[PDB]
Each structure stands twice: as C-alpha cells, then as structure tokens.
Amino acid sequence: VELQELNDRFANYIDKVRFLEQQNKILLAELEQLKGQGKSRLGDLYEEEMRE
Amino acid sequence: VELQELNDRFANYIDKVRFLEQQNKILLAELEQLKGQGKSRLGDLYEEEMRE
Amino acid sequence: DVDNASLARLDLERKVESLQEEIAFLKKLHEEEIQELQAQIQEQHVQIDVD
Amino acid sequence: DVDNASLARLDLERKVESLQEEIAFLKKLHEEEIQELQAQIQEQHVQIDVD
Amino acid sequence: VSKPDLTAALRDVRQQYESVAAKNLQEAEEWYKSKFADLSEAANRNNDALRQ
Amino acid sequence: RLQDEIQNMKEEMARHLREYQDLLNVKMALDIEIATYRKLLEGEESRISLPL
Amino acid sequence: RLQDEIQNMKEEMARHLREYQDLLNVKMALDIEIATYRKLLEGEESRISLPL
C-alpha cells in the first residue's frame, strides 16, 4: 500500500515535471524571437533603405 | 525495496522538477542577454555600414 | 543648402539608426508580449503557481 | 540634381517622423513584455495543501 | 484530493502581485514614452508652422 | 521634458524593482513549498519502502 | 529635432536596462531552485530508506 502510495507520489512529481517542462517551453519561445527573427529581417530591410 | 526505489524515483522526479526549473532559469538568463544585446549585435553590423 | 540640410539629415539618421535597433526590439518585444500573455493564460493552466 | 538630393533627404525625413511613433510604441511594448515575463517568473512556483 | 489547494490560492495571489507590480510599472514607462512623443511633435508642429 | 522622462523612467524602474521584490516574496513562498514538496515526496515513498 | 531623437532613444534604453535586471531577479529565483535541488538529493538518499 506504501509502494502504491509512493508510486502515485512519483506520478504526482512527474505531473510537477510536465508543469515545469511547460514553463521551460515559455522561456524558450521568449529567448528566440527578438534575437532570431527581429533584427535579422528588420535590419536587412532598413539596410537596403539606407543603402538606397 | 520497491517502495524505497519509488521514493528515490520521486526524489529523481523532484530533481527533474529542479532540472526543468533550472533549464527555464538558464533560458531566463539567456533571454535577458538576448533581449538586451540580440537587437544591438545584429544591428551593429548593418548600422555600422550606415554610420560609415 | 542641400549640404546644410544633409548635415542636419545625418544627425536625424543617427537617431533613426539607433532607434532601428529599437524598431527590431519593439516589433519582437510585442511578439514576446503575445508569448508571455499566452504564458499568464497558460500558467494558471499549468501550474497554478506550480503544485 | 536638386531633385536627387531631395530624394536622399526625403528618406531620413519620413524615417525621423515615423520613428517618433516607434519610440512611443517601444516604451509600452517593452514595459508590457518585462511585466508579463516577471508575472510568468512568479507563476513558475508552488502549491501544497495540508494534513 | 481533499486538498483543493490552498497553496495554489496563495501561489496565485503572489504571482498575480508579481505580475501586477511589473505591469503597473511598465504601463507608466510606456505612457511616459508616448506622452513624450505627443508633446515633442506638438512642440515640433508649433516650431514648424512658425518656420513656414 | 524628455530628459525628465529619462529620469522618471529610471525611478519607475526603481519602483518595478520593488514590485518585483513583493512578487519575489510570493515566489520565495512557492520555493519554500517546493522545498517542502521534496520532504512530502521523501516522506510518502518512505511509507511505501518498508521493513523486515 | 536631433536633440529630441537622441533623448527618445535613451528613455527606451533606460527602461530596457531594468527589464533585463528583473529577468536577472527571475534567474536569482532559479538559483534558489538550484540550491533546493541539493536538498532534493539529500532527500532522495533519505527517501529510499534503503528499506529495512
């Protein structure tokens, strides 16, 4: 009974892993956007305007 | 020994809770650097053409 | 007065260049507000403050 | 020749006009991003319940 | 399961105050930028009609 | 006025460092609840892991 | 006009300097999680009981 209660306690801490793996996907999306897709394209577009 | 391995397995999944907490805190320490400098480090190549 | 105006355009361009790092900042700090408003909508649904 | 110098000066005019709105956007969408992110970093955390 | 969580209700109120404190400061900074743009370009309009 | 908004912004950011201090009081309560959830996982899998 | 364009960029920068400082305060809360994960390893070594 303590085996099953501690089995289901490790299952509760796996659901706590899934919750922090979801937080880890928020802070990952928030890392990429400005650095990756912001100034790469918005620089390239204005770099051709100020070259003109 | 099964209830003890499943206690230590809940300790392993508490250390996966701490691991996804530590991964989201690494992505936080990287995204603050990549917001603060990730515009400017991709600008400074193009914008130093434009400044010259 | 094309030169006197152009020296004045370069002091405006110095603002524009610096402020166009700041466009690239601004246009993706808004995609990031839409990720972190999707974080505050997500994060009552999980978790709650994490149980 | 005066038209070509006016085409040069015209890009930096229309830019420094537009970039007054891009500052007025920058302040908001930055301070909105940092505040939703610093709400995420608080929702990161804990519940328990009690015996 | 008979723990309809009080620590979640105390976690909400903290993460909600952390979010509110950040957003109430960021709103005040973004209105300061926006009000500075309005007042500066109203001062430019008056300068420029006074140049025309 | 734009030089005073650079100063009001530094002090609004000094106020956001207090809004984040009061959010950090709630975050440190969740971090104590995580340090306690460790001891609950440690206690429950130990009830499952058992004597001679 | 050039003096105002120079002040507008500094107010935007002066806010972003603490938008990253509050992301370093979020990273400091992740170091409380890293400090708590050592008590999770001390807790896992305790959790197993190694039966009896």
Curated annotation (Swiss-Prot), chains F, G:
Modification Phosphoserine, positions: 46, 49
Tree of life domain: Eukaryota
Factors inducing expression: Up-regulated by muramyl-dipeptide and lipopolysaccharide.
Cross-link (Glycyl lysine isopeptide (Lys-Gly) (interchain with G-Cter in SUMO2)): 10
Localization: Cytoplasm; Cytoplasm, Cytoskeleton; Nucleus matrix; Cell membrane
Tissue: Highly expressed in fibroblasts, some expression in T- and B-lymphocytes, and little or no expression in Burkitt's lymphoma cell lines. Expressed in many hormone-independent mammary carcinoma cell lines.
Record-listed N6-acetyllysine modification sites: 10
Modified how: One of the most prominent phosphoproteins in various cells of mesenchymal origin. Phosphorylation is enhanced during cell division, at which time vimentin filaments are significantly reorganized. Phosphorylation by PKN1 inhibits the formation of filaments. Phosphorylated by STK33. Phosphorylated on tyrosine residues by SRMS. O-glycosylated during cytokinesis at sites identical or close to phosphorylation sites, this interferes with the phosphorylation status.
Disease: Cataract 30, multiple types: An opacification of the crystalline lens of the eye that frequently results in visual impairment or blindness. Opacities vary in morphology, are often confined to a portion of the lens, and may be static or progressive. In general, the more posteriorly located and dense an opacity, the greater the impact on visual function.
Oligomeric form and interacting partners: Homomer assembled from elementary dimers. Identified in complexes that contain VIM, EZR, AHNAK, BFSP1, BFSP2, ANK2, PLEC, PRX and spectrin. Interacts with BCAS3. Interacts with LGSN. Interacts with SYNM. Interacts (via rod region) with PLEC (via CH 1 domain). Interacts with PLEC isoform 1C. Interacts with STK33. Interacts with LARP6. Interacts with RAB8B. Interacts with TOR1A; the interaction associates TOR1A with the cytoskeleton. Interacts with TOR1AIP1. Interacts with DIAPH1. Interacts with EPPK1; interaction is dependent of higher-order structure of intermediate filament.
Function: Vimentins are class-III intermediate filaments found in various non-epithelial cells, especially mesenchymal cells. Vimentin is attached to the nucleus, endoplasmic reticulum, and mitochondria, either laterally or terminally. Plays a role in cell directional movement, orientation, cell sheet organization and Golgi complex polarization at the cell migration front. Protects SCRIB from proteasomal degradation and facilitates its localization to intermediate filaments in a cell contact-mediated manner. Involved with LARP6 in the stabilization of type I collagen mRNAs for CO1A1 and CO1A2.
Protein family: Belongs to the intermediate filament family.
Domain comment quoted from the record: The central alpha-helical coiled-coil IF rod domain mediates elementary homodimerization.
Protein name as it appears in the record: Vimentin
Protein source organism: Homo sapiens
Residues of the full protein shown: 364 to 415 of 466
